[PDB]
C-alpha cells in the first residue's frame, strides 16, 4: 500500500450529480473507505467497499474496481449541505489506514435571477469605518483576490434565507485607506 | 455516545506542556491521534490496538500517549514547538478494519510568546439603503479584526436568540499581514433579512465572537488586559429610516 | 507443486492456572509452525528461520500490536459467551482461520470457532453466513450476519489476502516446504507378527499396506513426528508369501519376505 | 464439558542402537483441555535436559505436542513418559520399548 489520488476540488450545481474519483496502488487490500468532513467538523464514515461492485444509501453511492485500483463516491440531487471535503482511504495487508489528501466539493446555488451589485455599509457607531458588499451575483462569477495588501477581500459565500426559498452569493471587502471606494473594488 | 475530545481550542507558548483528552463509551479497542495540515491530509501520530499497549504512527516525534483504559487515550505535547500548530483529531474503531469515529478536533496554535495573543475587535455594519430600495432585503455585515490565534466562533443573535437562516460566515479567518507568521486575523459574516424586518425598530441584531485565549492561571505581566477566553459582540437596532 | 495451507489457531482460557497463558496464537504453513504470539511474551515471534530472515522488524512490531488487540477481543468474546451460558470457572474459546492452494490452482478458505473444544460457529464464505450448533451461537451469528461490511471483509481476506500470504511464505520456505524425503522402509518379525516400518519421510502423507501373493486385517501405527522435520509409521500382520507396499509422493515401494 | 484424555506414544527418532546417540520422543495428542504436564524418565528419574515443541491444535479442536531429549540407549537403561492431565486421577506412565 503506497499511493492514493483524488482531485483537490470539484464544483457542481445544487440539484445535479457529482462523482468524486479515487485511484489507489497497493499490493494488499482490506477495503476502501469514503469519509465526509464538513469545514470546522470531524470526518464521519460514508462507505466501505472491498469486493468489486456498487453500494447505495439514500443519495450516496460507492463503487470499487479491484483490477483498476479505482473507487468513486456518487452524490445525487446535491444539496448545499453536501459542501464538504470527501476523504478516500484504504487498508493495506497490515491494516495500515492510507488517507488521500481529500476532495473539497463546492455546491453552486442555482441563481435563476442574478442582480449583481456592489453596496457600501456604514459602521453602526463610527461613520468613518466602511465595508463593501458585492451580492446577488451569478454562481459562475469569480471574486479575484486583492492586489493592494491594505485592501482585504473575502471568498464568495452562499447564504440561504430559508423561510423565503431564496439563496444569494456575497463577498465582503474593506480597507483603512481613505482613497477606498466600494466601486471598482471587486474587478 | 461517540468520542469526546477536549479542549476544542488551545494556545501554547513554545516549551509549554499540553495533554489533549479523548474518551469513548463504545468499548472500541482501537484509538488514534491524527494531525491535519493543509495539503498533507491525515497524519497518524500514535494509535493503540487495546488498553495496555500503544505504538507510533508516521509522526510520533514530540508526542506521547497512554492507554490505561479502553475508554481513554490522552495525547501529550512534552515541549510545544511552532511546528505542532495544527488541528488534532482523536478517533476510535471497534477493530483494525472497522470504521473510525472521530472526536470534534482540537485547534492548537503554538506561539513564541503569549504577548502575540489579542482578542477580536468586532463591529456591525448596517445594510445599504440602496440594497434595501433595489432588492427589498437588508444585509448586515460583521467584522472581527486584530485577533490571534485564529480560534473563534462567530454567531448571530436576533432578539436574543441565535439564528442560522440568512447567515454566511467565511470558512477561514484571513491574515491581516500575510507575510508575518504571527499575523493577527480577520473574519467576516453576513446576516440577510427582509427590508421590513430590518426597518422594524423592535428587532435587535448582535454579532457575537467567542474568542479562545489565555486562562486565569496563565501568568500575565503586560500593560494591556490579559487576553483571556471571552465574548466580544457588536449590535444594531432595526431602523425605520 | 502439491496442495499447501496457511492456518492460524487461537486459544483462550478464562481464569487460567499460574504459568498457563490466557491467550495463544500460532500460524502454520502445512505442518510447519511459522509464528507465535501469547499473553505472557506479548510479542509476535517467528517459529521458522526462513520466516525470521525474510520479514523485517516492522512486520513483527506491527503484528505484535495486532495480536495484543486480538487477545483483548478474545477475552471479551469469551466472558460474553460464558455469561450467555451462565458458565463459571475456566472455559475455552478456539478459532481456526486459513486457506488452501490446491494442485489445480483452485483455493479453499475456512473460519470456525469452538467453545470448550466443541464446534460452535462455522463460517460459509460463499453464502456469507454462519452455522450455529445451538441457540447461543445463533444469537452471535445474527449480530455478525447483520454486519455485511465485515462478512465481505472476511470473504475477501480468505479468498485474496490469505492466499497472497500463503504464496509469499511458500517462496520464503520453499526449500523446506516443497522438498521430498523418501521413506527408509524395513521389515522386523515379532509376537509371529511382521512389521513394515518407515522413517525419515516428508511430507507426512504416506500409504502402507500388506499383501499375500499380490492379494489384499492390519494394525496401523499412526504417522508420528520424528522431531527433525521427518516422520515415521508402521503397519503389521500375523497362506505363505507376504510383501509390504508403500506409496509416498507418487513413488510405490515393495518389500518381499 | 467433554474432556479428552491424552494419547501418549513413546519412540526414538532413529532406529534404536545401544550406545548410538538417538533422540527420545513422547508425543501427547487428542487431549482437551490444554493444561498438560509431561516428564521423560530415565530409570524412574525426571530428565532435566528435556526440550518440547510448543503446544499445537487439531482440526477437531484437540491439542498435541512433542517432548524429546537427546539420549543414548543401553541394555540396562529404561526410558518412559509421565503425563498428568485433568482426565487422570494419577499421572499416566508409558515406557519406551526398543524392539
Ligand atoms: C499472526 C496472525 C495473523 C493472522 C491471524 C492470526 C490469528 O488468527 O491469530 C494471527
Amino acid at each position: 500500500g503506497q499511493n492514493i489520488d483524488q482531485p483537490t476540488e470539484m464544483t457542481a450545481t445544487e440539484g445535479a450529480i457529482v462523482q468524486i474519483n479515487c485511484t489507489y496502488q497497493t499490493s494488499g487490500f482490506n477495503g476502501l473507505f469514503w469519509y465526509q468532513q464538513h469545514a470546522g467538523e470531524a470526518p464521519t464514515f460514508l462507505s466501505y467497499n472491498v469486493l468489486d461492485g456498487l453500494e447505495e444509501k439514500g443519495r450516496f453511492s460507492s463503487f470499487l474496481s479491484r483490477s483498476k485500483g479505482y473507487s468513486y463516491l456518487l452524490l445525487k440531487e446535491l444539496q448545499m449541505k453536501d459542501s464538504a471535503s470527501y476523504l478516500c482511504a484504504f487498508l493495506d495487508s497490515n491494516y495500515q489506514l492510507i488517507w488521500g489528501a481529500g476532495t473539497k466539493l463546492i455546491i453552486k446555488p442555482d441563481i435563476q435571477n442574478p442582480d449583481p451589485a456592489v453596496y457600501q455599509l456604514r459602521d453602526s457607531k463610527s461613520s468613518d469605518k466602511s465595508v463593501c458588499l458585492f451580492t446577488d451575483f451569478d454562481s459562475q462569477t469569480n471574486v479575484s483576490q486583492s492586489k493592494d495588501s491594505d485592501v482585504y477581500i473575502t471568498d464568495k459565500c452562499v447564504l440561504d434565507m430559508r423561510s423565503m426559498d431564496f439563496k444569494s452569493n456575497s463577498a465582503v471587502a474593506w480597507s483603512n485607506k481613505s482613497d477606498f471606494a466600494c466601486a471598482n473594488a471587486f474587478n | 455516545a461517540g468520542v469526546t475530545q477536549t479542549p476544542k481550542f488551545q494556545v501554547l507558548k513554545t516549551g509549554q506542556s499540553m495533554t489533549l483528552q479523548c474518551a469513548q463509551d463504545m468499548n472500541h479497542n482501537y484509538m488514534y491521534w491524527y494531525r491535519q495540515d493543509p495539503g498533507m491530509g491525515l497524519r497518524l501520530i500514535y494509535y493503540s490496538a487495546s488498553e495496555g499497549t500503544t505504538d507510533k504512527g508516521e509522526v510520533p516525534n514530540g508526542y506521547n500517549v497512554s492507554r490505561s483504559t479502553t475508554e481513554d487515550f490522552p495525547l501529550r505535547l512534552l515541549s510545544a514547538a511552532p511546528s505542532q500548530t495544527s488541528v488534532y483529531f482523536c478517533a476510535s474503531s471497534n477493530r483494525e478494519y472497522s470504521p473510525l469515529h472521530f472526536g470534534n478536533g482540537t485547534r492548537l496554535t503554538v506561539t513564541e510568546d503569549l504577548n502575540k495573543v489579542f482578542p477580536p475587535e468586532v463591529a456591525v455594519f448596517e445594510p445599504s439603503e440602496a440594497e434595501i430600495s433595489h432588492t427589498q432585503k437588508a444585509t448586515l455585515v460583521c467584522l472581527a479584526t486584530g485577533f490571534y490565534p485564529d480560534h473563534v466562533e462567530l454567531s448571530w443573535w436576533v432578539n436574543g436568540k441565535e439564528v442560522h437562516s440568512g447567515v454566511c460566515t467565511d470558512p477561514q479567518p484571513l491574515k491581516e499581514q500575510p507575510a508575518l507568521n504571527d499575523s493577527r486575523y480577520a473574519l467576516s459574516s453576513r446576516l440577510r433579512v427582509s427590508a421590513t424586518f430590518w426597518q422594524d425598530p423592535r428587532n435587535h441584531f448582535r454579532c457575537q465572537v467567542q474568542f479562545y485565549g489565555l486562562s486565569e492561571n496563565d501568568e500575565w505581566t503586560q500593560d494591556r488586559a490579559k487576553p483571556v477566553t471571552q465574548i466580544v459582540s457588536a449590535e444594531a437596532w432595526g431602523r425605520a429610516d | 507443486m502439491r496442495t499447501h495451507s496457511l492456518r492460524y489457531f487461537r486459544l483462550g482460557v478464562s481464569d487460567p492456572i499460574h504459568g498457563v497463558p490466557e491467550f495463544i496464537s500460532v500460524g502454520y504453513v502445512d505442518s510447519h509452525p511459522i509464528t507465535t504470539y501469547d499473553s505472557v511474551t506479548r510479542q509476535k515471534e517467528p517459529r521458522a528461520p526462513w520466516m525470521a530472515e525474510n520479514l523485517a522488524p516492522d512486520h513483527w512490531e506491527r503484528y505484535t500490536q495486532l495480536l495484543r488487540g486480538w487477545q483483548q477481543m478474545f477475552k471479551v468474546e469469551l466472558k460474553r459467551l460464558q455469561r450467555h451460558y451462565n458458565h463459571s470457572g475456566s472455559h475455552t474459546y478456539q478459532r481456526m482461520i486459513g486457506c488452501e492452494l490446491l494442485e489445480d490452482g483452485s483455493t479453499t478458505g475456512f473460519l470456525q470457532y469452538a467453545y470448550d473444544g466443541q464446534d460452535f460457529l462455522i463460517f460459509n464464505k460463499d453464502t456469507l453466513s454462519w452455522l450455529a450448533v445451538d441457540n447461543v451461537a445463533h444469537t452471535i451469528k445474527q449480530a455478525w450476519e447483520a454486519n455485511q461490511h465485515e462478512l465481505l471483509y472476511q470473504k475477501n481476506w480468505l479468498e485474496e489476502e490469505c492466499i497472497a500470504w500463503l504464496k509469499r511464505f511458500l517462496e520464503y520456505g520453499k526449500d523446506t516446504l516443497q522438498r521430498t524425503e523418501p521413506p527408509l522402509v524395513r521389515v522386523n518379525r515379532k509376537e509371529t507378527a511382521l512389521f513394515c516400518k518407515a522413517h525419515g519421510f516428508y511430507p507426512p502423507e504416506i500409504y502402507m499396506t500388506w499383501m499375500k501373493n499380490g492379494e489384499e486385517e492390519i494394525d496401523y501405527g499412526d504417522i508420528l513426528p520424528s522431531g527433525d522435520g521427518t516422520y515415521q509409521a508402521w503397519a503389521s500382520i500375523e497362506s505363505n508369501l507376504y510383501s509390504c507396499h508403500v506409496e509416498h509422493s507418487g513413488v510405490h515401494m515393495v518389500l518381499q519376505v | 464439558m467433554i474432556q479428552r484424555t491424552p494419547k501418549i506414544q513413546v519412540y526414538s527418532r532413529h532406529p534404536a542402537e545401544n550406545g548410538k546417540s538417538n533422540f527420545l520422543n513422547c508425543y501427547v495428542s487428542g487431549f482437551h483441555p490444554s493444561d498438560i504436564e509431561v516428564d521423560l524418565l530415565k530409570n524412574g528419574e525426571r530428565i532435566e535436559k528435556v526440550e518440547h515443541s510448543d503446544l499445537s491444535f487439531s482440526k477437531d479442536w484437540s491439542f498435541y505436542l512433542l517432548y524429546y531429549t537427546e539420549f543414548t540407549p543401553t541394555e540396562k537403561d529404561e526410558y518412559a513418559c509421565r503425563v498428568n492431565h485433568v482426565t487422570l486421577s494419577q499421572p499416566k506412565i508409558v515406557k519406551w520399548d526398543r524392539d
Side-chain angles (χ1 to χ4, degrees), chain B residues 66-223:
Chain B
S66 329
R67 192 82 180 284
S68 307
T69 65
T70 296
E71 293 65 47
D72 307 286
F73 194 41
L75 177 70
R76 191 138 179 277
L77 276 76
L78 300 80
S79 177
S83 76
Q84 301 181 303
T85 291
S86 209
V87 185
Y88 295 85
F89 290 95
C90 191
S92 75
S93 69
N94 189 49
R95 273 131 166 77
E96 56 279 354
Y97 59 66
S98 92
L100 279 61
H101 294 236
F102 284 76
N104 291 148
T106 292
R107 197 162 219 177
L108 186 159
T109 303
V110 174
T111 172
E112 35 172 68
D113 34 320
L114 293 194
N115 192 45
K116 306 278 206 66
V117 173
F118 297 76
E121 269 176 304
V122 183
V124 175
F125 304 78
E126 314 205 321
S128 170
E129 241 102 308
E131 184 193 6
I132 283 159
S133 70
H134 184 72
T135 68
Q136 272 301 285
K137 291 172 179 47
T139 299
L140 288 89
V141 172
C142 190
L143 219 57
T145 53
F147 68 91
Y148 187 98
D150 67 1
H151 300 174
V152 290
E153 297 166 334
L154 191 160
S155 56
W156 287 95
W157 292 76
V158 168
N159 307 315
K161 272 189 183 64
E162 195 177 1
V163 292
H164 294 104
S165 180
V167 175
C168 199
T169 296
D170 309 332
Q172 273 301 108
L174 147 161
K175 283 203 252 162
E176 303 189 312
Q177 305 280 279
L180 288 45
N181 285 185
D182 56 350
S183 165
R184 300 152 67 175
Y185 291 89
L187 178 76
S188 87
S189 186
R190 319 93 179 117
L191 166 64
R192 205 175 202 190
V193 306
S194 66
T196 60
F197 196 84
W198 168 248
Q199 278 159 0
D200 195 344
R202 286 174 310 185
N203 292 327
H204 180 268
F205 305 86
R206 195 161 59 82
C207 186
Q208 188 190 278
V209 184
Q210 178 74 69
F211 167 81
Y212 295 85
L214 311 197
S215 62
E216 16 191 68
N217 78 52
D218 283 303
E219 186 193 13
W220 184 262
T221 73
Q222 305 294 345
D223 288 341

Side-chain angles (χ1 to χ4, degrees), chain A residues 95, chain C residues 6-11 23-27 34-37 44 59-60 63 66-67 70 95-97 111 157 165:
Chain A
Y95 302 96
Chain C
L6 178 52
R7 301 153 192 280
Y8 295 91
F9 291 87
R10 286 180 193 166
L11 170 75
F23 171 91
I24 291 160
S25 170
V26 169
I34 48 149
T35 68
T36 191
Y37 171 92
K44 180 92 157 188
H59 179 275
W60 307 102
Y63 274 90
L66 288 163
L67 265 303
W70 291 340
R95 181 188 196 251
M96 179 201 331
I97 201 172
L111 171 60
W157 194 86
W165 281 117

Side-chain angles (χ1 to χ4, degrees), chain A residues 19-39:
Chain A
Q19 192 175 297
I20 311 176
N21 298 320
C22 179
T23 56
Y24 65 90
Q25 273 239 128
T26 170
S27 47
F29 176 89
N30 283 298
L32 187 148
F33 295 82
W34 283 97
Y35 292 77
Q36 184 180 52
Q37 190 184 18
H38 289 293

Side-chain angles (χ1 to χ4, degrees), chain A residues 29-30 55 66 93-95, chain C residues 62-63 149 153 156 161:
Chain A
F29 176 89
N30 283 298
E55 266 198 31
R66 295 298 311 263
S93 287
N94 297 339
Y95 302 96
Chain C
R62 178 48 178 178
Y63 274 90
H149 282 159
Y153 156 71
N156 187 64
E161 290 294 288

Side-chain angles (χ1 to χ4, degrees), chain A residues 51-130:
Chain A
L51 301 195
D52 278 356
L54 178 75
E55 266 198 31
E56 321 193 17
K57 191 162 208 175
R59 301 186 292 108
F60 296 10
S61 277
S62 55
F63 171 80
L64 180 57
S65 180
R66 295 298 311 263
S67 58
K68 297 176 157 212
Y70 172 39
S71 184
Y72 66 68
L73 181 75
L74 186 65
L75 286 81
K76 286 187 191 167
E77 306 142 25
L78 284 172
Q79 302 185 28
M80 299 302 301
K81 72 180 196 171
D82 299 348
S83 316
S85 281
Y86 293 88
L87 305 187
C88 174
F90 81 87
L91 290 170
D92 67 6
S93 287
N94 297 339
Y95 302 96
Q96 304 285 354
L97 191 55
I98 311 314
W99 285 99
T103 290
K104 182 176 175 233
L105 178 62
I106 310 174
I107 305 306
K108 268 176 175 166
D110 182 16
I111 307 300
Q112 68 301 115
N113 285 116
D115 197 12
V118 171
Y119 300 113
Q120 187 184 29
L121 296 62
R122 280 290 168 286
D123 152 69
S124 77
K125 303 277 204 229
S126 69
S127 214
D128 206 299
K129 293 219 306 300
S130 78

